[PDB]
């Protein structure tokens, strides 16, 4: 089973996304509700396979939280609404494996998780662009 950590999943939307991923036979969401240093510690000690981050969270907007997990061994998947300048370059440099549109179905996220676990990088072409 693929172990999945979702940053800030004590929040209802990210918690709901994790509940949906838990319905997959080959996936398990781990460390639910862990935040702050407690989260960074979970990722380092429990070593989840995949880390999902919403980069548009207010008071945590940007690539910094994802860049903070770049050396944890966790395969990062970022969720965003549209392209922002310099984001694609920062994601590639931080070793991000997935860079997806929030508008895509949750089936695309599950498939991206599997692809990322098979050594692939899944970037929405709409986001590899300089702007929206």
From Swiss-Prot:
Q: What is this protein called?
A: Transcriptional regulatory protein DesR
Keyword Transcription applies: yes
Task: Give the record's PTM text.
Answer: Phosphorylated by DesK.
Function recorded in the entry: Member of the two-component regulatory system DesR/DesK, responsible for cold induction of the des gene coding for the Delta5 acyl-lipid desaturase.
Upper taxonomic lineage: Bacteria, Bacillati, Bacillota, Bacilli, Bacillales
Identify a single GO molecular function assigned to this protein: DNA binding
Q: Which residues carry this modification: 4-aspartylphosphate?
A: 54
Tell me which UniProt keywords the record has, alphabetically.
Answer: Cytoplasm, DNA-binding, Phosphoprotein, Transcription, Transcription regulation, Two-component regulatory system
Its subcellular locations are:
Cytoplasm
Q: Where is the Response regulatory domain?
A: 3-117
One GO CC annotation:
cytoplasm
Species of origin: Bacillus subtilis (strain 168)
Q: Name one GO biological process term.
A: phosphorelay signal transduction system
């Amino acid at each position: 089973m693929i172990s999945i950590f979702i940053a800030e999943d004590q929040q209802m939307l990210l918690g709901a996304l994790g509940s949906l991923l838990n319905l997959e036979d080959d996936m398990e969401v781990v460390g639910k509700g862990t935040t702050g240093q407690d989260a960074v510690d979970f990722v380092k000690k429990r070593q989840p396979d995949v880390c999902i981050m919403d980069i548009e969270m207010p008071g945590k907007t940007g690539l910094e939280a994802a860049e903070e997990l770049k050396d944890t061994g966790c395969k990062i998947i970022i969720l965003t609404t549209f392209a922002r300048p310099g984001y694609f370059q920062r994601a590639i440099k931080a070793g991000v494996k997935g860079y997806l549109l929030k508008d895509s179905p949750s089936e695309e996220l599950a498939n991206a998780i599997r692809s990322v676990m098979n050594g692939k990088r899944i970037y929405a072409p709409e986001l590899m662009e300089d702007l929206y």
